[PDB]
Design a protein around this motif. Structure first.
Motif, PDB file in Angstrom:
ATOM      1  N   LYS A 129       0.827  -1.201   0.000  1.00 49.22           N
ATOM      2  CA  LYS A 129       0.000   0.000   0.000  1.00 49.22           C
ATOM      3  C   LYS A 129       0.864   1.254   0.000  1.00 49.22           C
ATOM      4  CE  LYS A 129      -2.033   1.881   3.586  1.00 49.22           C
ATOM      5  NZ  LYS A 129      -1.953   3.356   3.401  1.00 49.22           N
ATOM      6  N   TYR A 130       1.931   1.262   0.803  1.00 51.01           N
ATOM      7  CA  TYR A 130       2.805   2.425   0.872  1.00 51.01           C
ATOM      8  C   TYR A 130       3.711   2.557  -0.350  1.00 51.01           C
ATOM      9  CZ  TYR A 130       1.415   3.165   5.763  1.00 51.01           C
ATOM     10  OH  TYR A 130       0.703   3.411   6.918  1.00 51.01           O
ATOM     11  N   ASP A 133       1.661   4.849  -2.305  1.00 48.47           N
ATOM     12  CA  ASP A 133       1.501   6.122  -1.615  1.00 48.47           C
ATOM     13  C   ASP A 133       2.625   7.087  -1.982  1.00 48.47           C
ATOM     14  OD1 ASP A 133       1.558   8.112   0.635  1.00 48.47           O
ATOM     15  OD2 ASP A 133      -0.129   6.912   1.348  1.00 48.47           O
ATOM     16  N   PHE A 137       3.207  10.500  -4.654  1.00 51.65           N
ATOM     17  CA  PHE A 137       3.926  11.730  -4.340  1.00 51.65           C
ATOM     18  C   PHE A 137       5.114  11.926  -5.276  1.00 51.65           C
ATOM     19  CE2 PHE A 137       7.346  13.688  -1.631  1.00 51.65           C
ATOM     20  CZ  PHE A 137       6.872  14.987  -1.719  1.00 51.65           C
ATOM     21  N   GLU A 139       4.944  11.494  -8.428  1.00 43.87           N
ATOM     22  CA  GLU A 139       4.229  12.389  -9.337  1.00 43.87           C
ATOM     23  C   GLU A 139       4.765  12.418 -10.765  1.00 43.87           C
ATOM     24  OE1 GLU A 139       1.181  13.613  -8.795  1.00 43.87           O
ATOM     25  OE2 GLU A 139       1.591  13.790 -10.946  1.00 43.87           O
ATOM     26  N   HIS A 149      -3.425  10.365 -19.013  1.00 46.19           N
ATOM     27  CA  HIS A 149      -4.765  10.313 -18.435  1.00 46.19           C
ATOM     28  C   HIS A 149      -5.388   8.938 -18.625  1.00 46.19           C
ATOM     29  CE1 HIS A 149      -4.671  14.505 -17.434  1.00 46.19           C
ATOM     30  NE2 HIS A 149      -4.499  14.873 -18.691  1.00 46.19           N
ATOM     31  N   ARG A 150      -5.094   8.277 -19.748  1.00 45.46           N
ATOM     32  CA  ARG A 150      -5.557   6.907 -19.934  1.00 45.46           C
ATOM     33  C   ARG A 150      -4.749   5.937 -19.086  1.00 45.46           C
ATOM     34  NH1 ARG A 150      -8.542   9.538 -20.365  1.00 45.46           N
ATOM     35  NH2 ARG A 150      -9.352  10.736 -22.142  1.00 45.46           N
ATOM     36  N   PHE A 152      -3.875   6.989 -16.047  1.00 44.74           N
ATOM     37  CA  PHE A 152      -4.561   7.278 -14.792  1.00 44.74           C
ATOM     38  C   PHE A 152      -5.956   6.666 -14.719  1.00 44.74           C
ATOM     39  CE2 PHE A 152      -1.750  11.156 -14.026  1.00 44.74           C
ATOM     40  CZ  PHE A 152      -1.143  10.596 -12.915  1.00 44.74           C
ATOM     41  N   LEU A 153      -6.500   6.177 -15.839  1.00 49.23           N
ATOM     42  CA  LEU A 153      -7.799   5.516 -15.789  1.00 49.23           C
ATOM     43  C   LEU A 153      -7.704   4.166 -15.089  1.00 49.23           C
ATOM     44  CD1 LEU A 153      -9.707   6.187 -19.157  1.00 49.23           C
ATOM     45  CD2 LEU A 153      -9.443   7.654 -17.128  1.00 49.23           C
ATOM     46  N   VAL A 156      -5.511   4.166 -10.828  1.00 48.27           N
ATOM     47  CA  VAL A 156      -6.277   4.326  -9.596  1.00 48.27           C
ATOM     48  C   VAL A 156      -7.332   3.221  -9.454  1.00 48.27           C
ATOM     49  CG1 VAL A 156      -7.523   6.193  -8.303  1.00 48.27           C
ATOM     50  CG2 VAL A 156      -5.665   6.751  -9.892  1.00 48.27           C
ATOM     51  N   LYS A 157      -7.521   2.390 -10.483  1.00 51.33           N
ATOM     52  CA  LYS A 157      -8.257   1.146 -10.276  1.00 51.33           C
ATOM     53  C   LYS A 157      -7.480   0.182  -9.390  1.00 51.33           C
ATOM     54  CE  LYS A 157     -11.215   1.185 -14.329  1.00 51.33           C
ATOM     55  NZ  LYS A 157     -12.166   0.342 -15.101  1.00 51.33           N
ATOM     56  N   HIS A 160      -6.417   2.095  -5.763  1.00 50.50           N
ATOM     57  CA  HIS A 160      -7.399   2.171  -4.704  1.00 50.50           C
ATOM     58  C   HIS A 160      -7.692   0.778  -4.125  1.00 50.50           C
ATOM     59  CE1 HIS A 160     -11.068   2.102  -2.609  1.00 50.50           C
ATOM     60  NE2 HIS A 160     -11.628   1.437  -3.591  1.00 50.50           N
ATOM     61  N   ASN A 163      -5.041   0.093  -1.422  1.00 52.69           N
ATOM     62  CA  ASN A 163      -5.258   0.972  -0.277  1.00 52.69           C
ATOM     63  C   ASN A 163      -6.462   0.528   0.549  1.00 52.69           C
ATOM     64  OD1 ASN A 163      -3.217   2.323  -1.621  1.00 52.69           O
ATOM     65  ND2 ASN A 163      -4.092   4.358  -1.257  1.00 52.69           N
ATOM     66  N   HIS A 166      -5.914  -2.919   2.613  1.00 52.48           N
ATOM     67  CA  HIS A 166      -5.246  -2.821   3.899  1.00 52.48           C
ATOM     68  C   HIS A 166      -5.938  -1.875   4.869  1.00 52.48           C
ATOM     69  CE1 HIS A 166      -0.929  -3.371   5.729  1.00 52.48           C
ATOM     70  NE2 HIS A 166      -1.876  -3.998   6.407  1.00 52.48           N
ATOM     71  N   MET A 286     -17.807  -3.237  -3.115  1.00 56.12           N
ATOM     72  CA  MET A 286     -17.775  -1.793  -2.911  1.00 56.12           C
ATOM     73  C   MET A 286     -16.596  -1.153  -3.631  1.00 56.12           C
ATOM     74  SD  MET A 286     -18.819  -1.722   1.119  1.00 56.12           S
ATOM     75  CE  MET A 286     -20.497  -2.046   1.661  1.00 56.12           C
TER      76      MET A 286
ATOM     77  N   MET B 248      -3.366   3.651  10.209  1.00 59.16           N
ATOM     78  CA  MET B 248      -3.364   3.857   8.769  1.00 59.16           C
ATOM     79  C   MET B 248      -3.656   5.312   8.434  1.00 59.16           C
ATOM     80  SD  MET B 248      -2.349   1.401   7.118  1.00 59.16           S
ATOM     81  CE  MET B 248      -2.090  -0.366   7.113  1.00 59.16           C
ATOM     82  N   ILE B 253       1.216  12.951   4.475  1.00 53.62           N
ATOM     83  CA  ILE B 253       1.336  12.303   3.170  1.00 53.62           C
ATOM     84  C   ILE B 253       0.593  10.967   3.094  1.00 53.62           C
ATOM     85  CG2 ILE B 253       3.474  13.327   2.333  1.00 53.62           C
ATOM     86  CD1 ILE B 253       4.857  10.639   3.438  1.00 53.62           C
ATOM     87  N   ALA B 257      -2.621  11.507  -0.038  1.00 53.23           N
ATOM     88  CA  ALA B 257      -2.337  10.578  -1.126  1.00 53.23           C
ATOM     89  C   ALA B 257      -3.566   9.772  -1.542  1.00 53.23           C
ATOM     90  CB  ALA B 257      -1.200   9.639  -0.725  1.00 53.23           C
ATOM     91  N   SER B 258      -4.490   9.502  -0.621  1.00 53.01           N
ATOM     92  CA  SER B 258      -5.645   8.655  -0.905  1.00 53.01           C
ATOM     93  C   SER B 258      -6.867   9.436  -1.364  1.00 53.01           C
ATOM     94  CB  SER B 258      -6.006   7.821   0.327  1.00 53.01           C
ATOM     95  OG  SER B 258      -6.888   6.766  -0.012  1.00 53.01           O
ATOM     96  N   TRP B 350     -16.304   5.882 -14.916  1.00 54.97           N
ATOM     97  CA  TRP B 350     -15.110   5.335 -15.543  1.00 54.97           C
ATOM     98  C   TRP B 350     -14.289   4.474 -14.594  1.00 54.97           C
ATOM     99  CZ3 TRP B 350     -10.339   6.687 -13.523  1.00 54.97           C
ATOM    100  CH2 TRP B 350     -10.338   7.766 -12.631  1.00 54.97           C
ATOM    101  N   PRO B 352     -13.513   3.168 -10.088  1.00 53.03           N
ATOM    102  CA  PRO B 352     -14.075   2.953  -8.753  1.00 53.03           C
ATOM    103  C   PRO B 352     -14.015   4.202  -7.886  1.00 53.03           C
ATOM    104  CG  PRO B 352     -12.548   1.197  -9.361  1.00 53.03           C
ATOM    105  CD  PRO B 352     -12.346   2.308 -10.334  1.00 53.03           C
ATOM    106  N   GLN B 356     -13.659   6.103   2.677  1.00 54.51           N
ATOM    107  CA  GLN B 356     -12.668   5.739   3.677  1.00 54.51           C
ATOM    108  C   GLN B 356     -13.087   6.277   5.040  1.00 54.51           C
ATOM    109  OE1 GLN B 356      -8.542   6.586   3.026  1.00 54.51           O
ATOM    110  NE2 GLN B 356      -8.379   5.270   1.218  1.00 54.51           N
ATOM    111  N   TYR B 434     -13.000  14.630 -16.652  1.00 54.83           N
ATOM    112  CA  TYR B 434     -12.460  13.556 -15.822  1.00 54.83           C
ATOM    113  C   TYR B 434     -13.445  12.405 -15.638  1.00 54.83           C
ATOM    114  CZ  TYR B 434      -8.766  12.010 -12.657  1.00 54.83           C
ATOM    115  OH  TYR B 434      -7.715  11.338 -12.080  1.00 54.83           O
TER     116      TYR B 434
END
Lengths: 287, 436, 72, 436
Positions: A129-130, A133, A137, A139, A149-150, A152-153, A156-157, A160, A163, A166, A286, B248, B253, B257-258, B350, B352, B356, B434
């Motif tokens: 998970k870290y 994280d 950052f 970046e 951007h594609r 980034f599609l 984050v699937k 997340h 994240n 845990h 979820m 957690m 940071i 980040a989340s 697009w 999930p 949290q 977005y």
């Protein structure tokens, strides 16, 4: 129990080793991990037994909670045994908590040996998970294109999922066991019964974390996601070129294909009874 | 370890950070001049994360306070909480400033006191060998906090590149435009620096303050003495995983980040329900956690002026729901059970979403260990309504020939007005893009 | 679908959220049961059931035979 | 779940719905500004079916009240039951309207306030993800409730097509025609919308009100303060299966489905016997259920002006007999035993009939848990006598040259008078054809 509470510090020895390698404490085990993970990111050996034995000295003295700093000076959990193999198969680090008498009658060596291996997987999504994280950052490691951007599609699937794997999975297996262990402490009267409620405690900790000292499908769903994170972090330790971003969305389409493949395996493992995998599927729906 | 240096700056940024440090002593069980209670170490397991680490059990604040106006600091030293502050870390007695009311004043004063502004604030940087980052506790209203605050967002980006930047910035008031008229100019100049020269912000609207200040607080004449009460609690509420022992996202940071989807999309909506003292007489009957997060997503506690009919085509992506103190954690998964049935958050089609929830034990105090507290850190894509409000008040002012001859005499030779307009529309277009 | 063994847990948590949005007057009356369901005949309906287990000595009034007689 | 939005509209529709919500607090054991009794959850097992669901145990009414006349709403805020109503759901203080007395006024005002009339009443629609439907608690008398109420029967038919529509509409008075003379025009224009643009109605005659208001109530001067007493009880009586916990036809789409034979035949006859307070001293001796439904089919409690010698060639098709509170259900099948021996309902010779009886426990209150109550929802084919009464008063007025030049100046260019006449005769012919 009058003598096992005032003469000895029996349950205080238990909650300290639960803070050591079940990670109920604060940033003690965090500030152990991120020097190790920054050492991984620059390709320098963290094995290296000696300096690793002192980064865990600095862990157990952190936050000063007076149930583990005094155990850092005497009866230390610091001694770590490593196994080095040139084949590099079943590599294993083995940390041991020094436990006193007559607590060692309750706490066998095999008892902490399986409280060892749950830390080997709890630190591992703490490693997973870290990783997602600090790299967020970091970046966009470069700093035709326009594939970010594609990227980034489907980034984050998977950012997340790890994240939330845990956050919500852990906070249900830490509270439900911590509330049922406090039940058995409220009853607690004699030595033969304290051993049994501690042995039924670990088998719960088993069934909570995943299950299965033998082969099942949930470890395969774990170790697949582990290879997703490993290929993720190895990709981002470089610049992003013209065709390099096309290989990210090529990998990430496969990474969500096997992630959805192992979701449809997880429904069969949930309708076969009542489990903490029911809560892991309720997390994953979820998600 | 995890030491953060707060950058309190401006006429409003110094007062909202003054009671922020004053809030921290009442919950740590400490006095600003002594240690009279033993509740500081047995009750609180971590104290050296915002304070400087102790030399005589005197937890010095890691704070710097610069402002052109000497009026905000002359109302400090007569208060008994100023002896905790040091007269050598920032300024000694009789510190001053400019005249002064201009965005170009503090923007030009940054490079003439360039030697002194990068000398004493860097002495606190090497105190810890692992610095967390910098929070700019500055203001957007006026020319004092907006003029000098735009300079430090540039020179601290490369001198300290591996540090987190994220600010709790307050938005100005847009009710009438008589006392100040330079409000569309100095706001958009800092808002460009908040997206590309800064990673994240925490927005705090002024027109939404008096919506809450007359909601349950029951005042007739709105004064400035109420602006520090809503702000100082949610500042200490945001570091409850960081100050108090959590597991957690126990770092700054960790939380940011989340929630950030992408750069230039970082404007987080804030919510905080419990502000009434007569609720205390009925929290003795086990008021649960099942009712406190049903009203967070309901637009009642929000501090952002947004449209009410614009939430159907906008979608939540990241929502934080922080419970504090007594949680009764055997039903905290029960509270998250009821979220999917209502679908009060519109989810992005697009990818999930994520709800949290986290907890941490509060201070050993009777108003803190009895009443449930809910801190919200939302991220909804209806935040362009404020950006449409500020831009429509920006291009309308440039056609009235307002402050085009009165503003370009000092240190402005070219038209940098459309440099702020296109970059603001880049934010407004990438928000709606977005959700594909 | 034809029934599978995971549909027992899925219909269970659905009855959970359904009785929960209703606001029953007793929150703990809700998880006192779960639901049970055959192997795969054709359909899930007319093959499902209910397990409401019972505490101390009320169970001598409710033998495990006759809760099937109520469930059928 | 089963949330219904009431549409209170007009000069008479707002007053009959004002005491309808005032009746609901006395039976739920709640106060309009607080909760002082614990009888609300142990005695009543369901409360969130007409009220909005609670945020602080304050059950907000799901009600909207629009009228051109400000006199009906200025007699509300001084009453202590108006604090339960919200000043943001419908209107704030000082709401007004037209001048105004016309059917063409509210028919033309619907498309000039078209943006605002479909904005705040739709905010209560998405509160529950499974909406029951809409009840138009409007009036036929006057031009206020009849002019604007015909517009919402059209635009809510396609914007909300999968929702139940059914109204408790009151019929106007036909005694003399001096104060109002526009009564045959505005009534038949709404009556066309009540059959094809609306599924069901609940008729409430005005000439049958003073038949009951001097029967047992013993008044000398008939005032408007008695029109809310017969109406508000049978409104809450109709939802006793829906508010209180019942089993069969416990929804509003349960009751109306088992009584309507066909579209444009939905006019239901209502009956309600117990309205006298000195009956209470003799109900202590176990007054049974065997005598309360012998007088329902007997034409004494009816609220419909119909012919007495026209019931031999007309036939009942659906009859509802609702008992409430103490029923003694070991003899409720005994009461239905005696129905076939008298044959007080003429049965249709082409198909079967049905006498449906149902029960639900009443409020935990002493005038409610002691006295037997009988609510009737009949459906008899003698209802064309009112349609013959309204049509004979309609064609007689058009031959006297009355309101043909005074009515077609605004928004009426073609003769739509025979469009209402043939469709009314279509109802009157298909009723007599329905028994073959």
């Amino acid at each position: 129990m009058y003598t096992l509470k005032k003469d000895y510090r029996l349950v205080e020895y238990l909650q300290a080793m639960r803070n050591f390698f079940l990670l109920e404490a604060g940033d003690t085990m965090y500030d152990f991990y991120t020097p190790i993970f920054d050492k991984i990111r620059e390709k320098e050996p963290w094995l290296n037994l000696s300096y690793l034995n002192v980064q865990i000295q600095e862990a157990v003295g952190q936050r000063y909670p007076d149930d583990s700093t005094r155990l850092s000076v005497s009866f230390e959990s610091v001694d770590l045994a490593k196994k080095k193999l040139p084949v590099h198969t079943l590599d294993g680090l083995i940390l041991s908590y020094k436990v006193p008498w007559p607590v060692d009658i309750v706490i066998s060596s095999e008892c902490q040996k399986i409280y060892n291996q749950v830390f080997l997987l709890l630190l591992l999504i703490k490693w997973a998970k870290y990783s997602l994280d600090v790299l967020q950052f970091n970046e966009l490691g470069n700093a035709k294109g326009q594939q970010i951007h594609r990227m980034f599609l489907l980034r984050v699937k998977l950012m997340h999922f790890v994240n939330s794997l845990h956050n919500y999975l852990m906070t249900r297996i830490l509270h439900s066991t911590g509330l049922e262990f406090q039940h058995q402490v409220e009853e607690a009267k004699d030595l033969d019964q304290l051993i049994k409620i501690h042995y039924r405690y670990l088998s719960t900790i088993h069934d909570r974390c995943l299950l299965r000292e033998k082969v099942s499908s949930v470890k395969e769903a774990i170790m697949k996601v582990l290879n997703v994170v490993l290929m993720f972090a190895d990709r981002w330790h470089a610049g992003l070129g013209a065709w390099k971003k096309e290989s990210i969305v090529k990998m990430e389409s496969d990474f969500t294909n096997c992630h959805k493949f192992l979701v449809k395996v997880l429904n069969k493992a949930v309708c076969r009874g009542s489990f903490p995998h029911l809560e892991s599927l309720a997390l994953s729906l979820m998600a | 370890p995890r030491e953060i240096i707060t950058l309190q700056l401006g006429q409003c940024g110094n007062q909202i950070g003054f009671e922020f440090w004053k809030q921290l002593c009442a919950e740590h069980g400490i006095s600003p001049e002594g240690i009279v209670e033993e509740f500081a170490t047995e009750g609180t397991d971590r104290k050296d994360v915002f304070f400087y680490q102790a030399d005589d059990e005197h937890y010095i604040p890691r704070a710097v306070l610069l402002d052109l106006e000497p009026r905000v600091i002359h109302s400090i030293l007569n208060s008994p909480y100023a002896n905790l502050y040091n007269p050598e870390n920032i300024y000694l007695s009789e510190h001053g400033g400019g005249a002064g009311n201009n965005w170009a004043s503090g923007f030009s004063q940054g490079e003439k006191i360039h030697e002194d502004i990068f000398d004493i604030i860097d002495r606190e940087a090497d105190g810890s060998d692992s610095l967390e980052g910098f929070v700019l506790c500055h203001s957007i209203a006026g020319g004092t906090g907006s003029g000098l605050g735009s300079y430090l967002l540039e020179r601290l980006n490369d001198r300290y590149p591996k540090k987190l930047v994220q600010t709790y910035s307050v938005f100005p008031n847009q009710d009438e435009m008589s006392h100040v008229v330079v409000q569309p100019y100095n706001s958009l100049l800092t808002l460009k620096r908040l997206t590309q020269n800064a990673d994240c912000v925490v927005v705090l609207d002024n027109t939404a303050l008096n919506r809450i200040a007359t909601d349950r607080l029951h005042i007739q004449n709105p004064s400035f003495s109420q602006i520090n009460q809503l702000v100082s609690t949610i500042m200490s509420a945001s570091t409850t995983t960081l100050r108090y022992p959590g597991y957690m996202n126990n770092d700054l940071i960790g939380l940011i980040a989340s929630l950030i989807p992408t750069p230039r999309l970082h404007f987080l909506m804030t919510g905080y329900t419990p502000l009434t003292t007569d609720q205390s007489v009925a929290s003795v009957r086990k008021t649960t956690v099942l009712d406190v997060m049903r009203r967070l997503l309901q637009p009642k506690n929000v501090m952002v002026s947004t449209g009410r009919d614009r939430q159907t085509n906008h979608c939540y992506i990241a929502i934080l729901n922080i419970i504090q103190g007594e949680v009764d954690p055997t039903q905290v998964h029960k509270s998250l059970q009821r979220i999917r049935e209502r679908k009060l958050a519109n989810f992005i089609p697009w990818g999930p979403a994520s709800i949290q929830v986290a907890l941490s034990r509060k201070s050993p105090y009777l108003p803190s260990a009895h009443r449930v507290s809910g801190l919200m850190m939302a991220n909804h894509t209806n935040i362009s309504s404020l950006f449409e409000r500020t831009c429509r008040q920006y291009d309308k002012l440039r056609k009235r020939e307002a402050f085009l001859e009165q503003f370009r005499k000092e240190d402005i030779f070219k038209d940098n007005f459309d440099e702020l307009d296109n970059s603001r529309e880049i934010v407004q277009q990438l928000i709606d893009e977005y959700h594909a | 679908t034809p029934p599978t063994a995971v549909t027992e847990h899925d219909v269970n948590v659905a009855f959970q959220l359904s009785a929960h949005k209703v606001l029953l007057d007793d929150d703990n009356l809700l998880p006192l049961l779960n639901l049970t369901i055959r192997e795969a005949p054709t359909s899930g309906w007319a093959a499902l059931g209910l397990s409401y287990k019972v505490q101390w000595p009320l169970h001598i009034l409710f033998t495990p035979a006759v809760l099937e007689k109520y469930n059928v």
